[PDB]
Amino acid sequence: ELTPDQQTLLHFIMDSYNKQRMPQEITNKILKEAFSAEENFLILTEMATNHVQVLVEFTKKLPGFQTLDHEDQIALLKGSAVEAMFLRSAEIFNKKLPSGHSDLLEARIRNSGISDEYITPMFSFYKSIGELKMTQEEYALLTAIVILSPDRQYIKDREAVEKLQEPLLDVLQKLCKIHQPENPQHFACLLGRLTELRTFNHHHAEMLMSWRHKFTPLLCEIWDV
């Protein structure tokens, strides 16, 4: 059971996580736009760009994040952007769309000029995560934990990041005991998906160097393209 300060932290996180969702114009573009590599690619670029905005807004509200050294703030954002994008994309793919829109988004992703080297681990990861049957609290906390990863490159004050991450891990741990007492290794299973997640750093770097369609200036900045 959650201590009342753990409850206050969860509630604060969830309010920030629920605050920004997927705009209707993009969602309708999934259903209604022409299907072609260039057009499919553009939709996805537009989803990724909206995600970056949402990610920065959520990150800025994480307890303690604004007290960190300004260079550390940037390193955490840059270091977590891809992983957090994949985590949100899994949530959207499994939970936040009608059955129709998921099938069509999958099709669009599979025909957007992306290599098969990258597609296969992607859908494998989405099916893996989908089989965990995560709640929205679990997605919110895992997103926060991935952002506040103290082992990113060029983080000066790693201990300071550990302190911000640890309370979120403790809460996530209690939610895995509560919502699945059936499975006492469920917490570790979740943290296993973080390992899968980290592989998308290599895959995403590869897909990026293997270009040149234009990205947005925000995407180029946060991906270092």
Binding site: Q53, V56, E57, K60, Q73, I74, L77, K78, P217, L218, E221, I222
Partner: peptide, 12 residues
């Protein structure tokens, strides 16, 4: 090249 992310982080 901080410009966009920095703007997004610092803005109110």
């Amino acid at each position: 090249d901080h410009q966009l992310l920095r703007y997004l982080l610092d803005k109110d």
